[PDB]
DNA sequence: TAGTCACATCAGTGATCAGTGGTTACCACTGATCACT
């Protein structure tokens, strides 16, 4: 919802020539009338990312572009960063340099556990998408099919976290409660991702969306100053005053959202227990109950775990069969989609 | 048949730090025989 007015400016010398100007002009004339299905044909060696950038800059909408693999989306995002440097261009689905599914091969009867290799810049781009989508309008996000996978609702991502502005009377206890309510950990000697350095008047944080460090220095029970500093060295960058912080997860949830998630988890657990009792799957129901028992208590303690997406609906408050809350909800009703 | 799912816990796997654990006499007096009257 919150989207600062951004203008897409392209400095690349490449411009439409010959068939390209007429093609893009007709594309715009025939897109302005509201038809929901739009088919473009286009070969290689012509700058498809360039055409997407031209459409983006002459449409001025938050854009979600769609790619079916890595060796396309990665360089597409790099290009749209090149011709849109001021605007935020990032890669969302990503999350790995390599991955192994937590899947079940039925033919071999093999349950393979989840394995991840999270690149810091890759998850930086992902969380930059999920955050700047709710902080600015000039956002271009590239994603694979997992963009239609259910994350948390953008409403909670934008209003159930906290905003800090200089010279406000917010106690340290409330700050720590909100930090542990926005999925952050407790680490002092080193500075890792999503942990708070708490030393007297100094509270240093590393957002998931900005890999750098944010330091707030207190004066009593009222914050005195706020700055952007390097994580491990504390290098001064600039002077900032207002920061609407976002949690280290896309499944943001305040206390009442924990209540809603717990109630939904309980009701669907009862439904699934009844279904498995009717199906005669005693061992399966037991395994699910042990997994959910480990996956209920520590959400109301801190929240962050592996497999939180499997309960994402319970966080969102939606119903079965309804479209899951995805990156589309983060976009407004006037967003642009590219395939 | 392959690029999709979160910033997690394992269970040791298996060197180093650090509690403990033990270990190593100049004089001086009486002794005293043959030193003395």
UniProtKB/Swiss-Prot annotation:
The chain holds residues 22 to 359 of 719 of the full protein. Residues 29-339 form the Helicase ATP-binding domain. It comes from Mycobacterium tuberculosis (strain ATCC 25618 / H37Rv). Belongs to the UvrB family. It is found in: Cytoplasm. The beta-hairpin motif is involved in DNA binding. ATP binds at residues 42-49. This is UvrABC system protein B. Transmembrane segments: none annotated. A motif (Beta-hairpin) lies at residues 95-118. The UvrABC repair system catalyzes the recognition and processing of DNA lesions. A damage recognition complex composed of 2 UvrA and 2 UvrB subunits scans DNA for abnormalities. Upon binding of the UvrA(2)B(2) complex to a putative damaged site, the DNA wraps around one UvrB monomer. DNA wrap is dependent on ATP binding by UvrB and probably causes local melting of the DNA helix, facilitating insertion of UvrB beta-hairpin between the DNA strands. Then UvrB probes one DNA strand for the presence of a lesion. Forms a heterotetramer with UvrA during the search for lesions. Interacts with UvrC in an incision complex. It comes from the Bacteria.
